[PDB]
DNA sequence: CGGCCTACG
DNA sequence: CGTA
DNA sequence: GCCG
């Protein structure tokens, strides 16, 4: 038996039925695109619980009863099984709206409405960006400007010399802070698009003010590229390498120790397992759960975490290790 | 039928 | 809107 | 698209 929300089961990084998963997590970035937020989140629901089975889906039947499987999704598990493609997969994978869609809204600062009302302005490629510089956002043009690199993934001995860079200035910023990898990285993934750091105190309040000290320490040591009182940057870093560097986008977010636990599991992630787990908080437990604590909406009141272990456990579900949220 | 996670920049 |  |  399958639970149905992805909080309630564990999901490895390696699993059973990566063919199923990527063919259905195409037609919720479709559906994305389309403007369908709804069905985008049925089929990666779906797509996630294949992600958790123990086993090869090797037959239709192996589906029945399991949550978030209805006429669509088993229609295109069973083309699958039979013919080794789904022809509407296919289709939306051919062409030009989903390329171009997924071209655009993989550039850091361009999202689902700004690439459709570039596509429906008939822009096609990056260079057709490029030569219309007047329509970007500062964001939007760090993002084209860095592209090919940030199509480069982020690779293990990477996260290990930006941690470094990004201790080294927290350091320098306020003596006893503390730098979290979070993020994929984390979760146990290999590589990834961008690392995600977490920057706290342990002695509650210290850390005001610390994230503009440590931008501009790292801005002197010719370490940013791009970014931007404020909590979350989401920069993109000149990371040097063997003769010459290379541009990694790097988030970073400080935290008051007391919602440190908070913190960590909201942006660890993955971002589907906490949408869900949000979605169980709330309608399950009648808690409203983000990534800065988890309010009784009755009482008025914050529930008080020393770890991510006691916010599972306040929720009434199994504690799950971060290798296991890759919903 | 309506809901679908979340808050900051 | 973007982070996504 | 699926579900309460
Ligand atoms: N703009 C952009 N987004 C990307 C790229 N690659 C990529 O995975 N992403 C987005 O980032 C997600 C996975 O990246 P990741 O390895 O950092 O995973 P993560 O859980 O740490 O994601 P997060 O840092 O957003 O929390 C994907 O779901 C996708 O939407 C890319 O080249 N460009
Ligand atoms: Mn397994
Ligand atoms: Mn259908
Ligand atoms: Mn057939
Ligand atoms: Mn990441
Ligand atoms: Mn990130
Ligand atoms: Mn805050
Ligand atoms: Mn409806
Ligand atoms: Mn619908
Ligand atoms: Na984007």
Redesign the pocket.
Known sequence: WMP?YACQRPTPLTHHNTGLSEALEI?AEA?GFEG????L???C??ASVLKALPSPVTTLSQLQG?????????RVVQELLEHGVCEEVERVRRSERYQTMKLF?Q?????????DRWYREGLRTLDDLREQPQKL?Q??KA?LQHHQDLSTPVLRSDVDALQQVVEEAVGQALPGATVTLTGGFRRGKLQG??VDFLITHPKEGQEAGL?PRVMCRLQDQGLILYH???????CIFRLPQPGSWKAV?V?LVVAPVSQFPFALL?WTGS?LF??????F???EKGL?????GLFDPEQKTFFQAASEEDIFRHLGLEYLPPEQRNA
């Open positions: 149905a037609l559906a369908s937020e709804g069905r989140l049925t089929f629901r779906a399991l949550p978030h499987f209805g006429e669509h999704s088993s809204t550039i850091f600062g361009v999202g689902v409405k700004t690439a956002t964001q939007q993002g698009h961008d994230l931007q009182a404020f909590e979350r940057s989401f986008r988030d909201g971002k906490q949408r869900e787990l949000r979605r908080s709330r309608k409203w759960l983000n990534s800065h």
